[PDB]
């Protein structure tokens, strides 16, 4: 018998030859046949049947034989058969028939006899302790990895995913994340599988996390939140001493680093909503990451910070000890050369300080205000940035910083319902009215900055920053309007005006409408603040020739009472110093005469102050 004939007979005899040692001999032969031939001799139209025969031998070979046999034998039989299977999942010639491989996983008996439960049992952890069987495990992992990374037909992917969703498999996978397992034992393909089965399956996600427990209790020790955090920490304990210089010749170190990254990634995908995110935070996830990103590997730090950003809005972060974490993150932001980290950190910072007084207090005590100035100061103007990704990131970094600052400024501003700022806090805040940063922020308002998706939110946020700085008692107001940029030769008013005019040239879009409106409202609000706070009623009015009549802002369904009042007052103040605009503007006189009889006494009063300014005709 020659190769092909040796295979032919092997296939033919298989299902009538119950002899163990003949089956192994037989299996070795079919394998070597594939190994060499790469199927090219079999007739194309017989291929479905030829593949199906092999697959049925594979499936039959993996079944437990009635006689008592040594583990050593199965390991050898299975290695050959699983190797054929593996090859059936990457071999160009077989790919039209790949759905036949997937079909095999589809259950029939719902018991330990199905193909999938035989495959599943081979990657049980205890097999990694076995000197022979651990190689079959590593092959099954390559098989999953081949199917998952390989098949492009979306309907087939979906079916494969469905076939995998059974108790014994999810149990088997989780067992790798138990606290007593050394993380050296975690095959990387386990991540690949988890990503695959949870992809767009919310209920499975909540099952892994919660284990049918209530979402307000501690996440259970049997669930993944506790398991994955102990894996991060376990791996970190092992790499912590290790010199990162050894990396290129240190596969164990490389492995554990990638375990950490893949664990960050999995946690990212699992924590899909508020309750999941909160659970993570109450299980000390933030401390866990923060501890782990101490290790000087940049891929690791990026992935850690990405996950911190994702969890930064947790209300449970009001309860976590942040006295050590926050200073470390501030320090990391100060020194790390990567813009993705800067972005992630500052993003984390603004969310974490939001609505949390004691958290604001930690940030400020660790010089967060000085740091925000530094991060903003270090970047060039947006118009100096050529590549889009980079400019938009810088734009988001500045936005984050200014959002952080605004959260602080809010505390020292007198409300009807007064906190005092210390000597150091005052002078750090006052760095923001230095001429260079005013110039930078002014440029951001008015640069012919191109397609930058986060520009709208930056511009709205800068206006807010100016509003709060100028409403802040200890901030000097004398010099702000004397700052004239080198490029447009304009002061703050002109840049404010250029942004306002810009918002109206922008495309209409329900996604952005909310922010455009808040930018318009803040423009009006900042024009008033400048008028009152800088003693600049005249100059604000005359430097505002570039904007059309603000009254026309009320030509819609605008109900916000504070906005209406601001529009009316700013208009009246403008006509006090530039009377002729009253004849140049084109207003809805009925509407204005309407507002004279408004429920609000302030609106009604200002409306007929303004009406008196207009030509009777």
Domain ranges of the chain: 1-549, 550-617
Helix ranges (DSSP H) in 201-297: 202-210, 224-239, 251-270, 274-282, 285-292
CA separation for the pair 134, 142 (Å, rounded): 13
CA atoms within 13 A on the CB side of 142: 16
Residue partners of 523: CB distance under 8 A and separation at least 6 = 463, 496, 499, 500
What DSSP assignment string belongs to 566-602?
A: HHHHHHHHHHHH-TTHHHHS---HHHHHHGGG-SSHH
Of the candidates 499, 493, 487, 498, the one whose C-alpha atom is nearest the C-alpha of residue 470 is 493
Q: In 3-state terms, what secondary structure has residue 283?
A: coil
213's tokens: 């427990």
Pick the CATH number of 550-617 from 3.40.1010.10, 1.10.10.1630, 3.40.50.700, 3.30.2030.30: 1.10.10.1630
CA separation for the pair 423, 504 (Å, rounded): 42
Note the resolution in Å, 1 decimal. 2.6
For residue 137, the Cα-to-chain-centroid distance in whole angstroms is 33
Contact yes or no for 368/333 (Cβ under 8 A): no
Of the candidates 451, 338, 302, 459, the one whose C-alpha atom is nearest the C-alpha of residue 387 is 451
Residue 185 burial (CB count, 10 A):
13
CA atoms within 13 A on the CB side of 177: 29
Report the CATH fold assignment for 1-549. 1.25.10
Residue 111 burial (CB count, 10 A):
9
Contact yes or no for 527/467 (Cβ under 8 A): no
Contact yes or no for 79/135 (Cβ under 8 A): yes
First to last CA, the chain: 112
Q: Could you identify the residue written with the tokens 């302790």?
A: 129
Contact yes or no for 207/225 (Cβ under 8 A): no
Q: Could you identify the residue written with the tokens 């986060």?
A: 454
Residue partners of 107: CB distance under 8 A and separation at least 6 = 114, 116, 163, 166
CA separation for the pair 239, 573 (Å, rounded): 66
611's tokens: 């009406």
Q: In 3-state terms, what secondary structure has residue 296?
A: coil
362's tokens: 């930690």
75's tokens: 């390991």
- Can you give the C-alpha Rg of the chain in angstroms? 34
DSSP designation for 318: G
Of the candidates 431, 492, 501, the one whose C-alpha atom is nearest the C-alpha of residue 463 is 492
467's tokens: 């509003």
Residue partners of 215: CB distance under 8 A and separation at least 6 = 206, 275, 276, 279
Contact yes or no for 491/482 (Cβ under 8 A): yes
Contact yes or no for 354/407 (Cβ under 8 A): yes
CA separation for the pair 452, 458 (Å, rounded): 10
91's tokens: 């071999």
Of the candidates 338, 295, 324, 289, the one whose C-alpha atom is nearest the C-alpha of residue 309 is 289
Which experimental approach was used here?
X-ray
CA separation for the pair 567, 606 (Å, rounded): 10
Over the range 216-238, which residues count as b (16 or more CB within 10 Å of their CB) and which as e?
eeebbeebbbbbbbbbbbbbbeb
Residue 549 burial (CB count, 10 A):
16
Contact yes or no for 563/605 (Cβ under 8 A): no
CA separation for the pair 476, 473 (Å, rounded): 8
272's tokens: 């899909």
**Would you state the torsion angle of the CA atoms of residues 505, 511, 516, 519, taken in this order, to the nearest 10 degrees?**
-140
């Amino acid at each position: 018998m020659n190769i092909t004939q040796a295979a032919e007979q092997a296939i033919r005899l298989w299902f009538n030859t119950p002899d163990p040692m003949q089956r192994l001999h037989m299996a070795k032969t079919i394998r070597t046949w594939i190994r060499q031939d790469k199927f090219a001799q079999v007739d194309q139209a017989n291929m479905p049947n030829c593949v199906q025969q092999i697959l049925n031998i594979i499936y039959d070979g993996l079944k437990p034989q009635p006689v008592q046999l040594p583990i050593s034998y199965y390991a050898q039989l299975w290695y050959n058969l699983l190797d054929i299977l593996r090859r059936f999942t990457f071999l160009p010639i077989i790919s039209p028939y790949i759905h036949q491989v997937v079909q095999m996983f589809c259950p029939r008996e719902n018991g330990p006899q199905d193909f999938r439960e035989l495959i599943c049992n081979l990657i049980s952890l205890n097999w990694q302790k076995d000197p022979h069987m651990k190689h079959c495990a590593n092959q099954v992992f390559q098989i999953f990895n081949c199917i998952i990374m390989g098949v492009k037909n979306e309907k087939l992917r979906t079916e494969f995913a469905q076939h995998l969703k059974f108790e014994k498999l999810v149990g088997t996978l989780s067992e790798y994340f138990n606290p007593q397992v050394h993380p050296g034992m975690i095959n990387p393909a386990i991540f690949i599988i988890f990503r695959f089965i949870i992809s767009k399956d919310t209920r499975l996600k909540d099952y892994f996390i919660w284990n049918n427990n209530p979402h307000d209790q501690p996440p259970p020790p049997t669930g993944l939140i506790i398991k994955l955090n102990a894996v991060m920490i376990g791996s970190y304990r092992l790499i912590a001493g290790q010199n990162p210089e050894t990396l290129p010749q240190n596969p164990e170190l490389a492995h554990l680093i990638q375990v950490i990254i893949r664990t960050f990634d999995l946690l990212g995908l699992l924590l899909h909503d508020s309750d999941a995110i909160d659970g993570f935070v109450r299980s000390d996830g933030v401390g866990a990451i923060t501890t782990v990103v101490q290790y000087p590997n940049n891929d690791l730090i990026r992935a850690g910070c990405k996950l911190l950003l994702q969890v930064s809005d947790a209300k449970a972060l009001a309860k976590t000890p942040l006295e050590n974490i926050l200073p470390f993150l501030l320090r990391l932001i100060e020194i790390h050369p990567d813009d993705e980290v800067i972005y992630s950190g500052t993003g984390f910072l603004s969310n974490v300080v939001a609505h949390k007084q004691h958290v604001k207090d930690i940030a400020i005590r660790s010089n967060a205000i000085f740091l925000l100035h530094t991060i903003i100061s270090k970047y060039p103007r947006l118009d100096e940035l050529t590549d889009a990704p980079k400019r938009n990131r810088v734009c988001e970094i500045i936005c984050n910083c200014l959002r952080t600052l605004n959260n602080f400024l809010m505390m020292w501003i007198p409300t009807p319902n007064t906190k005092t700022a210390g000597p150091n806090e005052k002078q750090q805040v006052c760095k923001f009215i230095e001429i260079d940063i005013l110039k930078k922020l002014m440029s951001c308002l008015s640069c012919e900055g191109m397609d930058t998706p986060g520009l709208l939110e930056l511009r709205s946020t800068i206006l807010r920053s100016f509003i709060l700085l100028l409403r802040t008692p200890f901030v000097p107001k004398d010099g702000v309007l004397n700052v004239i940029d080198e490029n447009r030769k304009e002061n703050l008013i002109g840049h404010i005006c250029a942004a306002y005019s810009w918002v109206f040239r922008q495309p209409n879009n329900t996604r952005t409408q909310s922010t455009k409106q808040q930018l318009v409202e803040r423009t009006i609000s900042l024009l008033l603040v400048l008028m009152e706070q800088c003693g600049a009623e005249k100059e604000v009015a005359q430097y505002s020739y570039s904007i059309d009549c603000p009254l026309n802002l009320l030509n819609g369904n605008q109900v916000k009472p504070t906005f209406i009042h601001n529009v009316l007052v700013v208009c009246d103040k403008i006509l006090e110093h530039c009377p002729t605009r009253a004849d140049i503007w084109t207003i809805d006189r009925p509407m204005l005469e309407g507002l004279t009889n408004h429920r609000n006494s302030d609106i009604a009063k200002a409306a007929n102050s303004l009406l008196s300014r207009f030509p009777e005709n």
